[PDB]
Amino acid sequence: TKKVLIVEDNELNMKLFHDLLEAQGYETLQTREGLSALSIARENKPDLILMDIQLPEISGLEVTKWLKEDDDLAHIPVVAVTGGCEAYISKPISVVHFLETIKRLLE
């Protein structure tokens, strides 16, 4: 099963991403904090990371740099939600566009 780690501080955005990804048969991991994202990534080895750039406590871009600096996490594709990111998506989120981008990198 594909695993997508969702790093999003907003509950509404978090649920949507979660709901859409799960409906596609993907497993998901969730955290509102960039630092926890690093921990979870090493512990669960997700296949893709959906990174909110505008986190309140820290720059998602700085978390992405830490990811790319870790030999064990650098290979994991990172999709930015608005540098080391393989793709980006803007809000209002387009469901099809969102899902296509992720599948494109995962499948």
Residue 6 touches Mn ion, criterion: CB under 5 A? no
Nearer to Mn ion, 72 or 94 (CB): 94
Residue 9 touches Mn ion, criterion: CB under 5 A? yes
CB of 9 to Mn ion, least distance (A): 5
Q: Which range in 49-57, 64-72, 85-93, 95-103 contacts Mn ion by CB under 5 A?
A: 49-57
Q: Binding site for Mg(2+): which residues?
A: 8-9, 52
Q: How far apart are CA 36 and CA 46, in angstroms?
A: 13
What string of DSSP letters covers 42-64?
HHH--SEEEEETT-SSS-HHHHH
Of 51, 52, 63, 80, the one binding Mn ion by CB under 5 A: 52
Contact 4, 29 (CB under 8 A): yes
Compute how many other C-beta atoms are within 10 angstroms of the C-beta atom of residue 39.
Answer: 11
Residue 26 touches Mn ion, criterion: CB under 5 A? no
Q: Binding site for Mn(2+): which residues?
A: 8-9, 18, 22, 52
Contact 89, 98 (CB under 8 A): yes
How many residues belong to the chain?
A: 107
Residue 24 touches Mn ion, criterion: CB under 5 A? no
Residue 10 touches Mn ion, criterion: CB under 5 A? yes
